[PDB]
């Protein structure tokens, strides 16, 4: 959905989609289907659209209703941006695993850089099952298998929520100890030194020391848990 609103002459003169197939029109949850096709780059590429030198093959679905396990364009596995040359034909294939039950219109598309997106033919796919039954198994370099749907979220919560609780406790502690109207009146009458004393500074120093210690301990424990990591590719 969305192509009708795009200008006709830009749709016609950028990418010509031909034989496009959907291996299955009805899939179950955790069931794979392949959307294949071919595309031709129009020789008279419009000046308005940027060169297809930087482009990315994509599946036009209303969300992760299907999980893209792999995609290939130009005889190459293509998880990142590729280059399309003017006046040439390229074959593409996308593997999709059913996630969310329902009827969805899934299209072939190519997002070219600052020209933008070009949408190809779409088809209605019926996904039957429960999203709770969906699994996304992924094998690591050490042979361990994880579920990409659920992996790593517990660590995210266990690191993020306690720090938010600590910040809320800090704000609440200072608010209850001093107040807003009383502190304002004290500062306004030249008694700003009465709001903050030596004990308050000592408490702040202790809190900062504990926070730094917690950060160092968390970093060290995280490095111990995952000794070998690589940067984003």
């Amino acid at each position: 959905h969305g192509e009708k609103s795009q200008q006709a002459f830009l749709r016609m003169r950028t990418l010509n989609w031909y034989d496009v197939q959907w291996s299955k029109t009805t899939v179950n949850v955790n069931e794979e289907m392949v959307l294949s096709g071919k595309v031709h780059v129009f020789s008279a590429w419009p000046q308005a659209v940027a060169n297809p030198r930087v482009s990315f093959l994509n599946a036009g679905e209303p969300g992760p209703v299907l999980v893209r396990t792999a995609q290939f364009i130009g005889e190459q596995f293509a998880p990142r941006s590729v280059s399309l040359e003017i006046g040439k034909d390229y074959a593409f294939s996308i593997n999709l695993r059913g996630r969310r039950a329902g009827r969805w219109h899934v299209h072939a598309q190519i997002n070219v850089e600052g020209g933008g997106p070009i949408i190809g033919p779409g088809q209605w796919i019926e996904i039957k099952g429960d999203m709770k039954d969906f699994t996304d198994p992924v094998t690591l370099l050490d042979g361990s298998t994880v579920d990409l749907e659920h992996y790593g979220i517990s660590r995210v919560y266990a690191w993020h929520l306690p720090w938010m609780a600590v910040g809320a406790a800090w704000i609440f502690f200072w608010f209850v100890r001093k107040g807003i109207i009383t502190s304002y009146i004290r500062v306004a009458e030249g008694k700003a030194d009465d709001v903050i004393g030596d004990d308050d500074r000592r408490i702040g120093a202790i809190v900062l020391a504990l926070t730094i210690l917690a950060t160092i301990v968390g970093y060290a424990v995280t490095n111990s848990t995952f000794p070998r990591t690589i940067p984003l590719q």
């Binding site: 959905h1 969305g2 192509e3 009708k4 609103s5 940027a50 036009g60 209303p62 969300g63 329902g102 219109h105 598309q109 850089e113 600052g114 020209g115 933008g116 997106p117 949408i119 109207i181 009383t182 304002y184 009146i185 004290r186 306004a188 009458e189 008694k191 009465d194």
Partner: protein, 241 residues
């Protein structure tokens, strides 16, 4: 007898939060059924009607609120007793609390629901369901609440009645100025930048007037002085000792 009567604040908070919960449930139900295609008849049935009804309703509500606040204004403002002025300040603080809740709902919740909806769908119109709920529902609602707070302060409290508070003007106009800035949003996402990136300069206007929310810092201070001078020295001796 009742300096702090919070019935109005509670009513406003309950109404606004229930309305936004209803809006969120409606979005969940009808975002995929009718919001995916802009040229489909169900888009007109379920999403354009909200726009066509809500813009005139928002305008009428804002104009009527301003007119009613100005009509029922106090004429002898300077002859207000300290207790009545304290009650008026409390009601203004209730207005500002409701304004802050509306500012959170509009400028935070639906503005990023925009980032997620635009990342899931291919944009086909200037009025998407996220756009309809965000630009044409939430921003006008907090603009109406800002108008109410500003005019209550101007019409009830002598300090705000004589002249115009710069902080109040900023906090009431700047966040409203995001609504005209939707024109720059639409212009930049159709000619300037072809990609759905939030850090695009086409959204810097969105940033700039957002800073105007910090104008509230002044307004609260302007209230606090009025509170301070109302308590007096002896009352200060109570609070600070």
């Amino acid at each position: 007898e009742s300096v702090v009567d919070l019935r109005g604040m509670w009513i406003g908070l309950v109404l606004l939060n229930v309305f936004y919960l209803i809006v969120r449930i409606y979005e969940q139900v009808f975002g995929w059924r009718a919001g995916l295609d802009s040229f489909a008849p169900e888009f007109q049935t379920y999403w354009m009607s909200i726009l066509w009804t809500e813009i005139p309703l928002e305008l009428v509500s804002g104009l009527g609120l301003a007119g009613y606040l100005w009509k029922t204004r106090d004429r002898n403002v300077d002859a207000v007793t300290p207790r009545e002025e304290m009650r008026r300040l409390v009601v203004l603080v209730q207005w500002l609390v409701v304004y802050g809740i509306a500012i959170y709902w509009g400028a935070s919740f639906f503005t990023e629901q925009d980032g997620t909806w635009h990342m899931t769908v291919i944009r086909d119109t200037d009025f998407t369901p996220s756009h309809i709920i965000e630009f044409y529902m939430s921003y006008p609602i907090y603009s109406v609440i800002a108008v109410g707070a500003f005019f209550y302060a101007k019409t009830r409290i002598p300090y705000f009645a004589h002249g115009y508070s710069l902080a109040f003007l900023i906090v009431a106009i700047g966040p409203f100025m995001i609504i005209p800035n939707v024109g720059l949003n639409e212009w930049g996402h159709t000619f300037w930048f072809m990609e759905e990136l939030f850090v695009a300069p086409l959204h810097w206007g969105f940033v700039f007037f957002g800073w105007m929310a910090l104008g509230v810092f002044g307004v609260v201070l302007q209230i606090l002085m009025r509170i301070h001078a109302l308590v007096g020295k002896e009352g200060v001796k109570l609070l600070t000792e």
